[PDB]
């Protein structure tokens, strides 16, 4: 697989078993915080519908995405193994057209 600025994380949660309000916002913050160890994030989307527990991420550069994918892939998250896979830039932009011009690094909502 060819490296890009964009990736997908899977197995991060199961939407059917997520009851607490604003759970998806907490996942987003978990991912932002962890990606700040690499090179940060400019776009993130927590898929609240797919059973696979998918999170889409765009980093500010290809180098930042590679560092994040290598460090996130195969980790445990809440007792389950997570997968990280690259998404081609046109596939990602078709899903999320507003990410095309995102440039600002994201900050978690919580403290």
């Amino acid at each position: 697989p060819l490296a890009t600025q964009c990736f997908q994380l899977s197995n991060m949660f199961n939407p059917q078993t997520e009851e607490e309000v604003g759970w998806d916002t907490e996942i987003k913050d978990d991912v932002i915080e962890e990606c700040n160890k690499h090179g940060g994030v400019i776009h993130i989307y927590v898929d609240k519908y797919s059973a696979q527990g998918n999170v889409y991420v765009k980093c500010p550069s290809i180098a930042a995405a590679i560092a994040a994918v290598n460090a996130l892939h195969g980790r445990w998250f809440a007792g389950k193994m997570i997968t990280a896979a690259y998404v081609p830039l046109p596939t990602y932009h078709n899903l999320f057209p507003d990410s095309m011009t995102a440039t600002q690094l994201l900050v978690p909502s919580r403290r």
Binding site: D30, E34, R75, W76, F77, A78, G79, K80
Partner: peptide
């Protein structure tokens, strides 16, 4: 809150 690196029960 702790979810990163938490193995199964």
């Amino acid at each position: 809150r702790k979810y990163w690196d938490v193995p199964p029960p």
